Amino acid sequence: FGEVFNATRFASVYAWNRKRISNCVADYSVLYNSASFSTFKCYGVSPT
Amino acid sequence: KLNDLCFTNVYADSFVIRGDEVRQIAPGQTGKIADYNYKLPDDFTGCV
């Protein structure tokens, strides 16, 4: 998650880049813990 | 319609908070101040 979030350069919006995370253990807890995000909002699911 | 209601008593919970963390002061809100310092019940009746 740090690689996609703290990447050096995100592609531009017309060619947005789609990374495929798979076969791993994600800890979304630290995502909504960190305050570096102005918006962190989910649909069909609750971060908690 | 507050001027034509009679309540048993009123509770003024007063404090000072961050500028943009205001909208955490509401029922069902999740985040910094809601879940660490002060939250409102989901059956909350009253004004902010």
UniProtKB/Swiss-Prot annotation, chain B:
Integrin-binding motif: annotated span: 18-20
Domain of life: Viruses
Function: Attaches the virion to the cell membrane by interacting with host receptor, initiating the infection. The major receptor is host ACE2. When S2/S2' has been cleaved, binding to the receptor triggers direct fusion at the cell membrane. When S2/S2' has not been cleaved, binding to the receptor results in internalization of the virus by endocytosis using host TFRC and GRM2 and leading to fusion of the virion membrane with the host endosomal membrane. Alternatively, may use NRP1/NRP2 and integrin as entry receptors.
Subunit structure: Binds to host ACE2. RBD also interacts with the N-linked glycan on 'Asn-90' of ACE2. Cleavage of S generates a polybasic C-terminal sequence on S1 that binds to host Neuropilin-1 (NRP1) and Neuropilin-2 (NRP2) receptors. Interacts with host integrin alpha-5/beta-1 (ITGA5:ITGB1) and with ACE2 in complex with integrin alpha-5/beta-1 (ITGA5:ITGB1). May interact via cytoplasmic c-terminus with M protein. May interact (via N-terminus) with host bilirubin and biliverdin, thereby preventing antibody binding to the SARS-CoV-2 spike NTD via an allosteric mechanism.
Name of the protein this chain belongs to: Spike protein S1
Organism: Severe acute respiratory syndrome coronavirus 2
Name of the encoding gene: S
Residues represented out of the complete protein: 386 to 433 of 1273
